[PDB]
Each structure stands twice: as structure tokens, then as C-alpha cells.
RNA sequence: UUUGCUCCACACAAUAUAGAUGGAUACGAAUAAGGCGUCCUUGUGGCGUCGCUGAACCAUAGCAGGCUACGAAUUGCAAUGUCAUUUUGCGUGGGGAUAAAUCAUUUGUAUACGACUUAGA
RNA sequence: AGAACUGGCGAUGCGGGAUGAACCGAACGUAGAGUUAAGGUGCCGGAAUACACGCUCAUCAGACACCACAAAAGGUGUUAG
RNA sequence: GGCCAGCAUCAGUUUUGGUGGCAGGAUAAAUCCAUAGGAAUGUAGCUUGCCUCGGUAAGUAUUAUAGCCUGUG
């Protein structure tokens, strides 16, 4: 028989151990795990290497991560960064494109405008060859 | 080098008003690239312009300008309050304004 | 309320392929192909086995959860009817005058109509679709063979055959007049 | 911040497409919208035909052709829902209407421009899935508007230039970014990189 | 509102004939101190013989969650008010504390039987110990070994008002 | 009677803006799905990668921006400090084209009156 | 139709209830600034296409009390008990 | 010698931010650490048709090559 090709979504679903990045709040933009699902609209995270408070929040507040790592159903704060740190989940992370384009972007809004000058005349200088090797 | 403006465009919305009152004292200032009252206190006090076109030439020039300045934040949304010398006259409702930087504090 | 995770499976037989993608399932087998379009229900299909297909929806709560089974019978009734295809057998019931039917080539597809249903002159037409094949039977003489693949056209074929010769303005329970199906199974069978 | 704004109007809920349109114009934007046949909005289509053939009833009973006038293409459907929402019986609401170009179709002049799309007005961000919805076309055609064939004709003939124009453009762009590599190691780029760009 | 669980010590006013009455103790969830003396006097007149004039509060104490960051089963037994007679009702939620599951509570009653805070009396709140006595599919549901599910549908928040690419949904 | 008219080039003088002063920067379709790159047993394919806002991308330095391949000060501590686009007329030179309609008379396929429909160098 | 107490209209503008003598807020010299009431914040229309938990899809849904009509009796429609 | 503006230092009323110190409560409750006990949405390990270094199978086993809960300090 032929490959059946029956291929949908890979979602990321929300368990235990899937990391987020909370996007509102006090603690906005930084990394937590999730440690127990409390219902279908809320779940328990815990950041503890980020400095996040083990929290229940909504799935509002978060966003959901590509990379996940094996934690126990309700762990505690200890746990929970003793396994964040065998992970290596802040180097799993900042590897990422997402994060590469999070960092751009804080790196973009502190420029003084000397430092968006350089960037005009270095821009200029890169055009001159990029416009002269595709001629 | 093509540019030379050194202020922020801003629209003319309406006069600061209840439903069916209108009190033409108080115009309303929405400055394109403005969200939330924080951020919005960025303006406040900054001078405001509103030039037009005339066809008497007084003064060497046949294009006039109507000065003001911003004075408060309106509700939630980045529009502002703004007070002018001679109120503007309602047919600007949905013109350009120019809110310069004229009193800084950067 | 609203669920978790509602899951029904599908088992694919041998020589049998299901190729989903964007809720639209094709089903390739002997007897031949058979398309479906289920855009209309959001509910996910993951190839967990090359010998049956997984099939799930997400929260939903009590109507995605009813759809799901549709969804299922649905996926299952257009592979049995590539693995075995489908038949219905149907006969005349006639009283006094004899119900003529032929099938006959006109300008676009091959009609099939009835004549003398209880003396009437209007020559009764039915427009076939384009997956059944029609005969008739050896050894009895009342009966027609409608069959194909796609179970909706073969029972909605059967079913206009009797949706108009339907006595009016009479006693139904005095007249019974009229084709009938009679069996309901698969060809291969 | 465009002087002009083309809101290709595909899969978009009237009445919240109108509010944003109706905010905006009378800010002083001009705005045109096209593709408006492929307007959507909430309701079962027997819903919605309901109640068109509720608005068709209620004319003039003295001379009919001063009554309210039920107009049948999308583009003036969608026109019928901004103009309730402009004061249009005024000066400024009569200028705010001005501003204002509504087509069925993408027309020779918007063939060859960028089109936008409002986010609070989407049907895909709105609705929640498994509700039905009815589209402006099938409805207005239902009504008894007469074109829905022409701008379905002319309208993958359009079609068929802008996938061609996009091959070109697309082959452009992966010449470019081939030979952009070559220039992304140097020094000028890593002195770049360190400023964000 | 933002409830608080608090502890209300009263007693009637020493008299001649008793000059050493009883205490009695309510956990009240309320607001403030205020509405949570307001709703202990509301309490003990419907069990003793007492007013606010005929009595006094000897102790008003917040209490604190034990530990508010546990995810625990909590059984309610509620009584309330329809518009046809009273109603007692038995709900099983599942927050980190009394005071969140008390105002998810209030929020359903009021969703799913139009019960207003004034109709409502809140009996008992209680922990289920274990994961056999929890007895709703609501709850049962969520008590799965290794529970994953993915939200399909994503609606990204709009900043601004016009946006130049059609938005994906895709988690 | 090229005193009339039209089109062009710029030399100017008048009036009005529902409101220009870096760029309206182009696939289509789906959203319980897609975009891009590569390979290929070209398929409802395999693998990689991306989204998580356009907070982008492109242009952007030069007396309102010069000369060469030195200048800008004294618009005096701010006073838009004027640069855009339709209408219109005049002047110069440089081409180009040579008409109908209405009234009056008449018809009656029309008609209260106008209007309609006919005819007449 | 006839009484009892209070408040009001008559004699009274103003903000709200689209509009209304009586309802809600509040009673008035001429202006400026600030803050609010009753009511609201998609657009007309000044102000959150806010946030949080649920319910409902109606082939005449429903949406600010007075207030501008609604019952008895049914529906394994859906949800909770 | 005045009228129209701009800035500074003030005065009255007000509006909107940043930051410091102190006090209270179960002298916050938590987290964290130490100790004792416990169980399962049962972790190693041990039985267990083939067999994925005991994984699918389903028992045993309360920390073991993960952890959790409760009490006490």
C-alpha cells in the first residue's frame, strides 16, 4: 500500500513542561515552565533562573514556545530549576530566531541617534557592493 | 536629506464636546504615532501649528498660521487637548496639524 | 461543558490508500476512487498507522463531539464502498397495470423512465448521476440493479426512483403502487 | 501614515469593517475598498436574506420612487453600512463621504497597488469557527444583483497577470538574496549586526 | 470583587446573668472587614439570638492561603435562591486557593442560574484530599496521567489599525 | 478682416483648495493551516527553515543641499519663514483646423402652450 | 371616582432617559481651571473593537428602570443540579 | 514709554510620573532549608510470550538511577 499522506498541524499543546514567554504583566518577556494545567483557560508556571514568581496565570498572558524538556507533574521551585538548568533551556532559547529577532528589536530601540547615523552610513557602504556584485 | 521637518503630524478630530454640546475652546489633537496616555504625556506643552492658505498676501506671504500648544491627555486612546490663540474654526475637523518640539526637555 | 480530546479511528484496509490534506480525503482502492470534501467541520486527521487513521477534535463539547462520528461513518462508508462498493436492489409493486421501465440515451446523460404507472401518459424521467450503474435482474423480472461507489448517489438514485412514482390524490394506504428498494449491500459480496 | 489606503476587502465582517472605514474617513484618510463581492458577514445566509427581503418592504406608499432605495451590488451594500454610520446629512459628513471609493473587483488603477487588511474586522480573527457566515456576493446575487459573472470573469484574468507578475518577482528576489550572502560575513556586516542591523 | 477570606470572632454583650458568653466563629468570604462584619451579623442572627446592638466582635483576622501555589480540588456545598424556592447545589472546582475558587463560584452562579451575590450562602468549602472523590467530569477530565492538549485556534492582538499581510492562526 | 478658434513651449499676473512636504512598498488560497529554499521515485511528495507583527523593507549626509575633481556668521536667544496643484487671462514663436444650432416659414406620424416629427439656398 | 403622608410639576432652566411638565442626577449672577453625579465608552458621539468567568444562534434573537404589552401550557434544544 | 510673544525665578489651584524611609498582619502567608510520617495521576528496581540495554504488557516495590503531599522547627 501507498503512504497514506495524512499530515494537519504540528501544534505546540500546552503540558507539563512546556516553556512560555509571558507577554504581559509584571513580568512581561521573560521565560517560565509550565508546571500543573489548572483548567482549560489557566495553568501554574514557574521561572526561577528568569526571576518569574511560581504563578497561576491565564493562557492570555503567555505564549506558547517551541521547546519543552521532561519535568514532573507538579514540581517545586527547586526542581524546577535544578531540570531548567540541565536543560539548558536559556541556551536552547537564545539560539533561536525568535529570540535573535526579540534581542534585535531591544537592540534597535536603543540607539541614540549617533548610533543610527553609523548605521545610515554602514547601510550605504553595504549597498554599494551588494547593488554592484547583482550588476 | 530629501526631508527637513522637525515636527510630528498630528490630525484635528473635533472640539472637545459632550453629546449635542460642543465647547470650541478645546480642540482635540490626534499625533500620528501616539497610543496611550503614557506616551502621550511625551507632548504635553509642545507648541502646535495649523498652516493654511489665504489669498490676501499680508506680510510678505499668502500662507498663515494658527499657533497653539497641548495642554492635557485625553481619554486612553493617545488623543490630547490642545488650547490655540484663536480657537480653530471646524472646518479643520480631519486636517493636519503640526506639533513641533519647541518646549523640550530631552 | 467542553472536552478535552475526542478521538475516533478509521482502519484502512490493504490496497487501500486515504490521502487527506486541507480536510479534503481521497480513497483509492479496487473498485476505484472516491473524493469527500469535509471543509466544513474543523476536526484534525493524523496518519498514526499506515493500517488506520486517527481522527480527533479539540474542546468542541457535544456538537464537534456528534460531528466527529458523522465524520467517521462518513470516512468509513467511502472506503467500503472502494473495498467492496454498493448495491441496492429495488422492485416494481403494481397492481393492475405493468410499470414499463427502460433506460434510454438522450442528449446528456442516460435517463431511465417508467411508463403505464397506474395508466398514466406523463413519461416519469429520472437524470442518473455519473457513478451508478443500472441493470437488470435475471431470473425475477420487477427488479433493477442500481450500483456504484459513492453510497449518497446510489441511495439518492434509489430513492428518486420511488419519489416519483408516488400516487396522488388518493389513499396511499389503499394504492400501494410503485418501485421499492428492496435490498441494501455491496457488489463484491 | 499612506496618503491613500486600499483595504482589500476579502473575508472581512461588514459592520466591523464599516465602523473602522466610518472612524477613519471622517479623520480625514482617504480609504478605497476593494474587492467588496467577497465581503462576509455573520448570520446564516437565510438570515441575511431575511432581512434584505425585511429592508426590500419598506418604501414610499404615495410614489415609491422617493422611498428608501435598495441598492443590490456589495459595493453599495457596504456604502449602505458606512453611510449609517457617517452623519451624511451634514457638510463634514457629505466631505467624509467623498473620501471615499468602494468597487467590486480590483480595477485597473488598484491592480498594480498594495492592498491592506483591517485585523479588528476579520472573520477569521471574529468568528468563532463552526459559525456560519454569509458571503456579500452570493447574497447580493440572491437579491438581485445582475454581475456577479463579469467580475468573476475579470477577476482571474487579473489573477492570472498578478501569479505571473509574482513568479518574476520572486525569481528576482531569490537572485538577490543569492548574491547578498556574499556581502553578509564582511566587516561592514559585522559592525552592522552590532546595532541591531 | 476581589474576595478575602476573613475570621470573625463574636459575642454577645456581657450581661449580669452571663457575664462570660459564648464566642462564636464565622469564616466569611468578602471584600473588606467592613462587608465581612456586615455579613457575620447577617450570619448569627439566623442562629442565635443576637443583633449588632445586642452584641460585639471581639476579633476580625485575615486568613492567608496555607499554600497558595498547591492546585487543589475544592468541593463546594452551596445553598441559593431561584426565583421558585431554594436550591442546595454541590460544585467541584479546581484552583490554588479558596479565595479564587469562592469567586469562580460566584462568577458561574451568576452565569449558569442568574443567582446574585445576595442570593447566594457559600456552606462549605473543602479540599478533596484525594483524586477518587471528585465526582464531576468537569474536574475528572483535567485528572489524566499526562494531560497535553493544543489550542487551534490563535488570534494574535492587533496593535495598530491597518495590517499589510493576511494573519495566520497556526500555534 | 491669422481681430476669430485649437494644440504646443515658457515669460508672467489672478483665484481657489474637506487639507501633499521621504516611499499607496501589487500573488492567490486556506486558517483543525500556510510562506520560502533545496532535492525528486513531479506528489494532496521528502527534508530544512520561518512566523510569535510593517517596531519591517527601501531610500536618507552635501548653502531647501553649492564651486572645485573653498563657502555658508549679522534671519542677531523662537515667530510657517513660503518650494506643492488645479482653474484662468495676457505676451512671444511654432504648428494645425475652416462649423452648426435656435427663432421665423413649413409638415402632421405630434400637439393645451412649450415640446415632438418633417421640409426648404 | 374619592382620601392619608412626603416629594415634585404648576412657577424650573441644566446633564441623562433618542424625543416627553411629573423619572434619575442636580436646582441657575458673569467667566477661567480642575473633579464628578445620573448615564455611558464599535460608528453616528466626547470616552477601553478594555480585561476576567460562563450562557445563547432566534426562517419576527436580545439590548438603559418609570416605559411605551405580555401569560397559562409545552420543547430527551443546550447547560447546571 | 507702552501692546503682542518667549524664557527664567516665584505665588495660588491642579494634573501626571520617578524614587526613598518607616509601621502593621499568623511580627504576612509562601518559596528555601532541616526532620518525621504518608500515599499515587507509582519513580528506580524485581516478576514478566517475542522484544526496543527491563520498552510496549500488568503486577510488586513508597525514593531507589525522578518527584510529590502532610505535620513540626
Same mark, same amino acid.
Given at each position: ?76 521551585? $527547586?526542581? *524546577?530549576?535544578? %531540570? +531548567? =538548568? #540541565? $536543560?539548558? *533551556?536559556?541556551? %536552547? +532559547? =537564545? #539560539?533561536?530566531?525568535?529570540?535573535? %529577532?526579540? =534581542? ?32 | ?106 | ?189 | ?197 | ?171
Amino acid at each position: 500500500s501507498t503512504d497514506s499522506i495524512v499530515k494537519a498541524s504540528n501544534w505546540r499543546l500546552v503540558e507539563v513542561g512546556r516553556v512560555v514567554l509571558i507577554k504581559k504583566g509584571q513580568s512581561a518577556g521573560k521565560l517560565a515552565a509550565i508546571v500543573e494545567i489548572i483548567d482549560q483557560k489557566k495553568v501554574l508556571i514557574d521561572g526561577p533562573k528568569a526571576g518569574v514568581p511560581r504563578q497561576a496565570i491565564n493562557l492570555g498572558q503567555v505564549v506558547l514556545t517551541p521547546l519543552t524538556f521532561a519535568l514532573p507533574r507538579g514540581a517545586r521551585t $527547586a526542581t *524546577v530549576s535544578k %531540570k +531548567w =538548568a #540541565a $536543560a539548558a *533551556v536559556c541556551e %536552547k +532559547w =537564545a #539560539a533561536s530566531s525568535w529570540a535573535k %529577532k526579540i =534581542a534585535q528589536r531591544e537592540r534597535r530601540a536603543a540607539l541614540t541617534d549617533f548610533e543610527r547615523f553609523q548605521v545610515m552610513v554602514l547601510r550605504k557602504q553595504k549597498r554599494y557592493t551588494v547593488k554592484k556584485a547583482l550588476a | 536629506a530629501e526631508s527637513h521637518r522637525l515636527y510630528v503630524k498630528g490630525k484635528h478630530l473635533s472640539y472637545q464636546r459632550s453629546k449635542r454640546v460642543n465647547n470650541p475652546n478645546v480642540s482635540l489633537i490626534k499625533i500620528e504615532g501616539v497610543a496611550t496616555p503614557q506616551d502621550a504625556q511625551f507632548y504635553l506643552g509642545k507648541r502646535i501649528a495649523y498652516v493654511y492658505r489665504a489669498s490676501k498676501e499680508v506680510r510678505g506671504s499668502k500662507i498663515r498660521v494658527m499657533w497653539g500648544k497641548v495642554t492635557r491627555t485625553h481619554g486612553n486612546s493617545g488623543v490630547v487637548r490642545a488650547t490655540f490663540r484663536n480657537n480653530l474654526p471646524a472646518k479643520t475637523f480631519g486636517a493636519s496639524v503640526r506639533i513641533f518640539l519647541y518646549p523640550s526637555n530631552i | 461543558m467542553k472536552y478535552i480530546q475526542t478521538e475516533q479511528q478509521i482502519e484502512v484496509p490493504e490496497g487501500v490508500t486515504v490521502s487527506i490534506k486541507s480536510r479534503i480525503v481521497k480513497v483509492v482502492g479496487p473498485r476505484g476512487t472516491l473524493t469527500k470534501n469535509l471543509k466544513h467541520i474543523d476536526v484534525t486527521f493524523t496518519k498514526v498507522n499506515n493500517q488506520l487513521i486517527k481522527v480527533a477534535v479539540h474542546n468542541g463539547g457535544r456538537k464537534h463531539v456528534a460531528a466527529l462520528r458523522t465524520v467517521k461513518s462518513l470516512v468509513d462508508n467511502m472506503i467500503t464502498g472502494v473495498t467492496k462498493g454498493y448495491k441496492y436492489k429495488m422492485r416494481y409493486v403494481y397492481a393492475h397495470f405493468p410499470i414499463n421501465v427502460n433506460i434510454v440515451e438522450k442528449d446528456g446523460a442516460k435517463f431511465i423512465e417508467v411508463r403505464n404507472f397506474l395508466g398514466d401518459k406523463k413519461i416519469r424521467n429520472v437524470p442518473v448521476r455519473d457513478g451508478v450503474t443500472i441493470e437488470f435482474s435475471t431470473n425475477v423480472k420487477d427488479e433493477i440493479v442500481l450500483s456504484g461507489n459513492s453510497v449518497e448517489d446510489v441511495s439518492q438514485n434509489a430513492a428518486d426512483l420511488q419519489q416519483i412514482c408516488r400516487v396522488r390524490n388518493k389513499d396511499i394506504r389503499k394504492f400501494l403502487d410503485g418501485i421499492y428498494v428492496s435490498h441494501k449491500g455491496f457488489i463484491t459480496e | 501614515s499612506q496618503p491613500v489606503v486600499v483595504i482589500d476587502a476579502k473575508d472581512h465582517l461588514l459592520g466591523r469593517l464599516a465602523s473602522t472605514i466610518a472612524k477613519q474617513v471622517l479623520n480625514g484618510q482617504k480609504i478605497v475598498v476593494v474587492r467588496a463581492e467577497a465581503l462576509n458577514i455573520s448570520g446564516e445566509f437565510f438570515r441575511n436574506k431575511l432581512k434584505y427581503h425585511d429592508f426590500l418592504r419598506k418604501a414610499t406608499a404615495f410614489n415609491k420612487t422617493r422611498g428608501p432605495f435598495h441598492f443590490r451590488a456589495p459595493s453599495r451594500i457596504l456604502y449602505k453600512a458606512i453611510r449609517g454610520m457617517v452623519s451624511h446629512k451634514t457638510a463634514r459628513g457629505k466631505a467624509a463621504l467623498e473620501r471615499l471609493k468602494i468597487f467590486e473587483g480590483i480595477p485597473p488603477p488598484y491592480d498594480k497597488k498594495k492592498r491592506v487588511v483591517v485585523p479588528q474586522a476579520l472573520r477569521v480573527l471574529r468568528l468563532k469557527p463552526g459559525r456560519k457566515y454569509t458571503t456579500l456576493g452570493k447574497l447580493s446575487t440572491s437579491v438581485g444583483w445582475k454581475y456577479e459573472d463579469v467580475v468573476a470573469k475579470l477577476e482571474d484574468k487579473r489573477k492570472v497577470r498578478s501569479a505571473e507578475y509574482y513568479a518574476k518577482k520572486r525569481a528576482f528576489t531569490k537572485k538577490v538574496s543569492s548574491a547578498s550572502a556574499a556581502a553578509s560575513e564582511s566587516d561592514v556586516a559585522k559592525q552592522l549586526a552590532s546595532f541591531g542591523y | 470583587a476581589h474576595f478575602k477570606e476573613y475570621q470573625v470572632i463574636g459575642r454577645r454583650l456581657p450581661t449580669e446573668s452571663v457575664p462570660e458568653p459564648k464566642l462564636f466563629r464565622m469564616r466569611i468570604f468578602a471584600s473588606n472587614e467592613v462587608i465581612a462584619k456586615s455579613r457575620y451579623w447577617y450570619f448569627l442572627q439566623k442562629l442565635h439570638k443576637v443583633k449588632k446592638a445586642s452584641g460585639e466582635i471581639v476579633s476580625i483576622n485575615q486568613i492567608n492561603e496555607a499554600h497558595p501555589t498547591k492546585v487543589k480540588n475544592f468541593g463546594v456545598w452551596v445553598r441559593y435562591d431561584s426565583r421558585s424556592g431554594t436550591h442546595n447545589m454541590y460544585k467541584e472546582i479546581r484552583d490554588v486557593s479558596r479565595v479564587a475558587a469562592v469567586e469562580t463560584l460566584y462568577q458561574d452562579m451568576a452565569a449558569r442560574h442568574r443567582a446574585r451575590f445576595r442570593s447566594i450562602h457559600i456552606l462549605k468549602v473543602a479540599e478533596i484530599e484525594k483524586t477518587a472523590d471528585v465526582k464531576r467530569q468537569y474536574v475528572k477530565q483535567f485528572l489524566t496521567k499526562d494531560l497535553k492538549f493544543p489550542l487551534p485556534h490563535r488570534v494574535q492582538k492587533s496593535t495598530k489599525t491597518f495590517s499589510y499581510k493576511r494573519p495566520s492562526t497556526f500555534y
